[PDB]
């Protein structure tokens, strides 16, 4: 079954191309594999864009199928897409990936040191729990 459709007013996340990594709102469907979109608030000038480079999110905001950028921005601000996107888990994973990429060598060493303890404690406690479960089974 399909849950994410392409209609007027859906928010999609651009994966690659000029505006890579930005949200955008679908205004119209030009053709089978091209849509007229704009990110009035995410800094993306109104333009055409292929379907091959956007990934659909589960955010819908209402405006007519050819409304101008004024009304598109009005609907975007009214629905407050930015904070909800920042709060969703998708953006959290993206932001964490960006953090890991940005990490320099000193924080790499610090992360190694912290992970050593984290794994050691977890492994010891897991051994304790496994022994306890075995004793309970016996």
């Amino acid at each position: 079954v399909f849950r994410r459709f392409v209609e007027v007013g859906r928010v999609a996340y651009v994966s690659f191309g000029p505006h890579a990594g930005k949200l955008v709102a679908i205004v119209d469907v030009i053709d089978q594999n091209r849509a007229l979109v704009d990110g009035p608030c995410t800094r993306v000038r109104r333009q055409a864009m292929p379907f091959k480079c956007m990934q659909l999110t589960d955010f819908i905001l209402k405006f007519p199928h050819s409304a101008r950028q004024k009304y598109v921005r009005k609907a975007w601000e009214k629905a407050d897409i930015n904070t909800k996107w920042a709060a969703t888990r998708w953006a959290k994973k993206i932001e964490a990936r960006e953090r890991k990429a940005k990490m320099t060598d000193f924080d790499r060493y610090k992360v190694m040191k912290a992970k050593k303890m984290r794994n050691r404690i977890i492994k010891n406690e897991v051994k304790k729990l496994q022994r306890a479960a075995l004793l309970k089974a016996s």
Binding site: F5, I30, Q55, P64
Partner: protein, 176 residues
């Protein structure tokens, strides 16, 4: 013509040189879809030589300039009247496309002609390009996009960038 890249629309006006017979020959204007102004002028001379008794040696390009799209943010339906050469005989046709720019629609027309009839740019003679209302549209491939509540999914997304993780332990997912 070599339909290189995306075409551009040029307004080209030309006239015969003044002669003792007539001081001021009438100026003739034409719309040329071309990669650049040089080939635009060449096509203008070709068409005007077919139409009138005019040649480049006995004429002059009074003006030649690109005409920009009037509304490049409104998706429009374009009807194109076209004249092309097959392997046996020549035919007139009318085709509709859906795009934001007249030049983009004409480029789509050239690519579609090459794909469907193996006709080449030196065979296609473009005749008329008009904005056509959705009620006046008559090709179903364009008409099916005329509704307020358009809605369709992307069913089978094929994995691109197949080579960046050239060896990956997942079998990729095609349902998003």
């Amino acid at each position: 013509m070599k339909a290189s890249g995306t075409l551009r629309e040029y307004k080209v006006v030309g006239r015969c040189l003044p002669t003792p017979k007539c001081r001021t020959p009438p100026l003739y204007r034409m719309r040329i879809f071309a990669p650049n102004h040089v080939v635009a002028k060449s096509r203008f001379w070709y068409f005007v030589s077919q139409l009138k008794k005019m040649k480049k040696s006995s004429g002059e390009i009074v003006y030649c300039g690109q005409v920009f799209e009037k509304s490049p943010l409104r998706v429009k339906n374009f009807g194109i009247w076209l004249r092309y050469d097959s392997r046996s005989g020549t035919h007139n046709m009318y085709r509709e496309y859906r795009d934001l720019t007249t030049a983009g629609a004409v480029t789509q027309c050239y690519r579609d002609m090459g794909a469907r009839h193996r006709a080449r740019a030196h065979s296609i003679q473009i005749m008329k390009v008009e904005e056509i209302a959705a009620s006046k549209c008559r090709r179903p491939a364009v008409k099916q996009f005329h509704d307020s509540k358009i809605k369709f999914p992307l069913p089978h997304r094929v994995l691109r960038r197949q080579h960046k993780p050239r060896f990956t332990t997942k079998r990729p997912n095609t349902f998003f």
